[PDB]
A paper describes a structure:
A typical TCS is composed of a sensor [name] (SK) and a cognate response regulator (RR), which are encoded by genes that are often clustered in the genome. Modulated by stimulating signals, an SK first performs an autokinase activity and phosphorylates a conserved histidine in its DHp domain. Here, we sought to determine the crystal structures of a [name] homologue, lpWalK from [name], which shares 60% sequence identity in the DHp and CA domains to our previous solved smVicK structure, in different conformations in the presence of ATP analogues or ADP. The catalytic region of lpWalK contains one DHp domain (amino acids 370–450) and one CA domain (amino acids 450–624).
Numbering used by the authors:
A (entry chain B): 383 to 444, 450 to 567, 570 to 610
B (entry chain A): 372 to 565, 570 to 610
Write the structure that this text describes.
């Protein structure tokens, strides 16, 4: 049943991603030859991914990671692409949310599990938007230093209490204050151990009035 | 130890069912997406039709995920319930008012239905969670409307006894087999239909009503109709 809670949570980003592209296609993009095949490709990939997700989360209930060498620039770019589409077909005024990308010009190659790591990126990107009720710009950086590849995601949202910067990675822990709104508290806990499974590190810095920055570090080579 | 056994076995089939039930819309989706990708997107007489179906399968899964989440919070005691003293007469009336309002707008209604109200005349004040309890009434009212003949009457009663507040909602449909009066509240139990409709509604409603300290059950005679009951402890 821990299966049920986890799969319910983790299916939310792909379903939202899937619906956004379907609505874009439905809104008229299906008539447009230079975008429709690309959009359809994303829906096909997200649908297949959700099926891969359902089966594996059920098997875990009975150290299963699929490591491949990946170009993080391209993947993170792909992940952000899905969120851009989400934001363009959302209920909010255009430019109410913005994803700013600041990637290094180098191509960074890292050993990760593509499906499991995507879940991590989805959770944090979801958080950055969801806890930015008054809108905001999300800043996503990608760089390598000291043999580590580092991803950072910054928001102009609500902050995180300094006392709770450690607790946000705990399972079912949610910040107990009021917003301008919250769910289970499973996102960052799940996200943390996937990063730890990949040999990485995750941490957060925040100012309670202006926003937060989450960090992921992965082994380079 | 058949106790812990039955607990562990109910859980295993539920989990299997959730795997199967989430897998099915996605597989349908995959087929439509491949048809579109294989070339149907270029075709104006099928592409819009296909896209709508994919949208519905997606929407249905979102309703499923949300319902699976309500059940998981309930299954863990994470659910936050707020018992407050409210006028049940007025609340039930508002629920019925909103359903009445829907039918009074002519989107060439699929099926015309009538709601007869038989409320007690004393005003009943009770501790409940209005938001969660309203959800239950909608679920039963939706069912009552969905499974009633064309021109049928839905009978909504509110009555009190020394120790119980009783709400009953009756439909004039084909009813429910005596063997399935308990089973209709089980998770994923739905009429044989092989889009929409999860079969989690009454399961959620049973656990919400039980959460509020109440009781829910159904009586039916095949061919004549069904009556659903909600009992809440009075004063
Ligand atoms: N950018 C941000 N700004 C402010 N608070 C944040 C934040 N990112 C996370 N948090 C807080 O830290 C906690 C992280 O827990 P987690 O994200 O697992 O809960 P959750 O899964 O219910 C969020 P969601 O419903 O969007 O998936 C949240 O309760 C949230 O309040
Ligand atoms: N008033 C009624 N009369 C006859 N059968 C009913 C009924 N209410 C429910 N049922 C049957 O019991 C099962 C459980 O109903 P429930 O309302 O939980 O399904 P659901 O969650 O998909 C909402 P809906 O069926 O209105 O879309 C359904 O499959 C339905 O066939």
């Amino acid at each position: 049943k821990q299966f049920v809670s986890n799969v319910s949570h983790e299916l939310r980003t792909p379903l939202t991603s899937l619906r956004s592209y379907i609505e874009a296609l439905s809104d008229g993009a299906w008539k447009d030859p230079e975008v429709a095949p690309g959009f359809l490709k994303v829906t096909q990939e997200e649908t297949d991914r959700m099926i891969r997700m359902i089966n594996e989360l059920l098997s875990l209930s009975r150290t299963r990671v699929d490591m491949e060498l990946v170009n993080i620039n391209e993947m993170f770019n792909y992940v952000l692409d899905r969120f851009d589409m989400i934001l363009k077909k959302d209920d909010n005024p255009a430019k109410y949310y913005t994803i700013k990308r600041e990637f290094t010009k180098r191509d960074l190659w890292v050993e990760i599990d593509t499906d499991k790591f995507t879940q991590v990126l989805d959770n944090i990107m979801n958080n950055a938007i969801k806890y930015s009720p008054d809108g905001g710009v999300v800043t996503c950086r990608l760089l390598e230093t000291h043999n580590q590849v580092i991803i950072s995601i910054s928001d102009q949202g609500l902050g995180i209490p300094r006392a709770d910067l450690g607790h946000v990675f705990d399972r079912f822990f949610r910040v107990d204050k009021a917003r301008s709104q919250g769910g289970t508290g499973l996102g960052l806990a799940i996200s943390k151990e996937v990063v730890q499974m990949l040999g990485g590190r995750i941490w957060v810095d925040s100012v309670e009035g202006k926003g937060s920055t989450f960090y992921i570090s992965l082994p380079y080579e």
